[PDB]
Amino acid sequence: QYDISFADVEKAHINIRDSIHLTPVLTSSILNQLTGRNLFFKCELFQKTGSFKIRGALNAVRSLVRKPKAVVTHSSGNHGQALTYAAKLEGIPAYIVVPQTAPDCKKLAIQAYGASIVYCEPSDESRENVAKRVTEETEGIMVHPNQEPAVIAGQGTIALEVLNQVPLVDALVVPVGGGGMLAGIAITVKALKPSVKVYAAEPSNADDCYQSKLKGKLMPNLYPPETIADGVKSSIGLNTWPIIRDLVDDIFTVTEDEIKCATQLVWERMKLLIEPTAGVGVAAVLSQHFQTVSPEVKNICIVLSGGNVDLTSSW
Amino acid sequence: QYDISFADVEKAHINIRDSIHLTPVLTSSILNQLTGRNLFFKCELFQKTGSFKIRGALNAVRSLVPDALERKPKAVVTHSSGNHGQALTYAAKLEGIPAYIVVPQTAPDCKKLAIQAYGASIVYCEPSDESRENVAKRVTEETEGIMVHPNQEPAVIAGQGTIALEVLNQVPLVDALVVPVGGGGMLAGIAITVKALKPSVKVYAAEPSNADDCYQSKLKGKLMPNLYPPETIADGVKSSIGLNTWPIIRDLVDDIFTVTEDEIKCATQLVWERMKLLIEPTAGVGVAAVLSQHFQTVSPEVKNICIVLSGGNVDLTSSW
Ligand SMILES: O=C(NCc1nc2ccccc2[nH]1)c1ccco1
Ligand SMILES: O=C(NCc1nc2ccccc2[nH]1)c1ccco1
Ligand SMILES: O=C(NCc1nc2ccccc2[nH]1)c1ccco1
Ligand SMILES: O=C(NCc1nc2ccccc2[nH]1)c1ccco1
Ligand SMILES: [Ca+2]
Ligand SMILES: [Ca+2]
Ligand SMILES: [Mg+2]
Ligand code: NA
Ligand code: NA
Ligand code: NA
Ligand code: NA
Ligand code: NA
Ligand code: NA
DSSP, X not given: OOSOOHHHXXXXXXXXXXXXXXXXXXXXXXXXXXXXXXXXXXXXXXXXXXXXXXXXXXXXXXXXXOOOSOEEESOSSHHHHHHHHHHHHHTOOEEEEEETTSOHHHHHHHHHHTOEEEEEOSSHHXXXXXXXXXXXXXXXXXXXXXXXXXXXXXXXXXXXXXXXXXXXXXXXXXXXXXXXXXXXXXXXXXXXXXXXXXEEEEEGGGOHHHHHXXXXXXXXXXXXXXXXXXXXXXXXXXXHHHHHHHHOXXXXXXXXXXXXXXXXXXXXXXXXXXXXXXXXXXXXXXXXXXXXXXXXXXXXXXXXXXXXXXXTTOO | OOXXXXXXXXXXXXXXXXXXXXXXXXXXXXXXXHHSSEEEEEOGGGSGGGBTTHHHHHHHHHHOOSBTTBSSOSOEEESOOSHHHHHHHHHHHHHTXXXXXXXXXXXXXXXXXXXXXXXXXXXXXXXXXXXXXXXHHHHHHHTTOEXXXXXXXXXXXXXXXXXXXXXXXXXXXXXEEEEEOSSSHHHHHHHHHHHHXXXXXXXXXXXXXXXXXXXXXXXXXXXXXXXXXXXXSOGGGOSOOOTTTHHHHHHHOOEEEEEOHHHHHHHHHHIIIIIOOOOOGGGHHHHHHHHSSGGGGSOTTOOEEEEEOOBOOOOTTTOO
C-alpha cells in the first residue's frame, strides 16, 4: 500500500543495528510536572553523528544480503554528516557538493569529518548538475534525505526501540520536516501496536505537514520557510505524505518562541544539548493545543532527534 | 519463489502478536560445557497452548478465507488431535468461531476426552483416509469453515517463521538456529525468515533417525516421505515433509542432523534435570542434535546456537 511496509523496517533493523547506538530513554521530573504527562525522551541526540539520520543513511548505503561505489550529497547538515559516516563504515568515498561561495567555516568541518569536497557554483542548477556528474563519474548513489524508501525504513527503527524500552507508551511525538522519520515511525507503530498514538510536531512558520493534513492533500511550503528549527525546513513529499495522511493521528504546530523556550528548558533542566529542531517535539507537548489530547494518553515518548548545535551561536 | 515469502512472515507476526507470548531465550552453563558451544534456548514450551503451533494456527484463522464469497471463516477444521488441534482450537476460541477435530473411531478415549474439555467439537470418521477426507470436507462445507493443515498451509508456515524474527531480535550474535522437523512448517518458515534477513546465519534441522524422511529427501535431492508411519518417542514430528515445505528445506536449510531414540531420551532427561524445563521429547530432538557426534562437523566459527524448545505438552503420567 505504502512506499515501505513494516517488513522494510525489520530488514533495516537487522541491517544497521550492529553499527548504531541503541540510544537510551531518559525522564525528567520537572517536564512531567510542567505537562501533566509521564514523559519519556528517546535520546537520538546521543546517536552516532549526533542525530537519528545515521539510521536511514546506513540503511540506504548498506545491503542486507551493483553495491554503491560512492555516496554524493548536497547536505552539509545532519543528512550529509550521516551519509559520510555511513560511507566511511562501508569503505566507500563520500562527496559533498558545496557552493564555492560557502562559509570558510564549514569547508574545514566537512573534510575533518572525512568527506571529499566538490565545489559547485551557488545556483541550485549548478549544485544539482555537479552532484549528478559526481554520482555518474564515481558510479555512486545519491540518497534523498526523507523520501528514499530505505531512509524511511531506517528511521522506523527508532519506534521499534521505543516500543521495547517504554512498553506502556501511549503516544510518540515526532518532529516533522520531510517526514521520513515521522513516516517510518508511523509504519512501525501502526504495525506493532496501533492503539499507540503517533503525533507530529512542526514549526508553525513551516507548517506544510499541518496544512496538508488539514486539506487532505500534499501542500508543500510555497517558499523556503524561516525557522530556528533548521532541520525541519524540508516539506513533506510524495512518499511520506500518504503514510502521514493515513497513519499519523495529529499534528501540533509551535511558534518560534515556543521552540526556543522548550529548547532552553531542555538545556537548563535536563542538561541535554538538543538542537532547536529537537526542541520542536518538546514545545508541542508543552503547547496549549496539546491539552486537547485525552487524559488516557499519559505515557508519551518524545524523540529528541539531534544534538548538532553550533555552540558558537548557541537568544 | 516459494509458497511463502518473508513479507508473509511479517504479515503473520502483525496478525498474531497481540495474542501470543514473546517467549524468552534461556541459557544453561551445563549445556554450554557439554557441547563446546554458546547455546540459547528459545522457549516455545512457554507459548500459549504449550507449543509454537499457536503462531501458524492463529495466523491461519486471521488470514484465510473459506470461500471466494465469504472473507471470514465461520469455523475451523483439522485432522490433528495433538499440538496443532489444541492450538487451532485456542485460535478459534479467540476469534469466537467453533473448532472441529475430525477423529477416527479408533482414537484412544483419553484423546477424545481431552479434545472436548479444551472446547473443540469432535466429528467421527473411519480410520481410512477416504473417510477422513470425506468427513472433513463435509464439515468444512456445512460449517463454512477453513481446513487448516498442520504444516503445509502457507498461512501456517508463515506464522511459524515468526519464531525466527524473535530469535534474531533476541540473540543478535546468533550463528545458527537448530529446529526439530516433522512436516517442516516450522523449519521452512524459519528458513525463509533467516535467509531473507541474515543468510550468514545457519539453519539446521534435527530429526529422529527413526523418522528420517527430511534427511533422506535432502540426501536424494527429492521429496521422499516416510513409506510407513514412523515409530519414535518424538510424537510431534511423525509427519513427513510435504510439497510446500520441501522446496524451502531443499534450498534454504544448511544441514540435517538425525538422532537416535536413546539420544532424544537422554537429551530430554538432561533438559528436565539440568534446566528444569518440562519439554516434550519432540523438543528434545534439537538438543540431541547439538549433542550428537555428527554435530561436531559443524565449524567452530558457528559458536552461538539457538535451539528451538518447540513444545511442553507432555503426558506427565506417561513420563518411557
Ligand atoms: O555543519 C554542520 N555540522 C558539521 C558537519 N556538517 C557536515 C556535512 C558533511 C560532512 C561532515 C559534516 N560535519 C551542521 C549544520 C546543521 C547541523 O549540522
Ligand atoms: O548549524 C548547526 N546546527 C544546527 C543549529 N541550529 C541553531 C539555531 C540556533 C542556535 C544554534 C543552532 N545550531 C551546526 C553547525 C555546526 C554544528 O551544528
Ligand atoms: O493429546 C494431546 N493433547 C491433548 C489435546 N489435543 C487436542 C486437540 C484439540 C483440542 C484440544 C486438545 N487437547 C497431545 C498429543 C501430543 C501432544 O499433546
Ligand atoms: O502425549 C502427550 N504429549 C506427548 C508426549 N509424548 C511423551 C513421551 C514420553 C513422555 C511424555 C510424553 N508426552 C500428551 C497428552 C496430553 C498432553 O500431552
Ligand atoms: Ca513543515
Ligand atoms: Ca521426519
Ligand atoms: Mg511513491
Ligand atoms: Na548513549
Ligand atoms: Na494505556
Ligand atoms: Na472453502
Ligand atoms: Na519482530
Ligand atoms: Na559470528
Ligand atoms: Na506449493
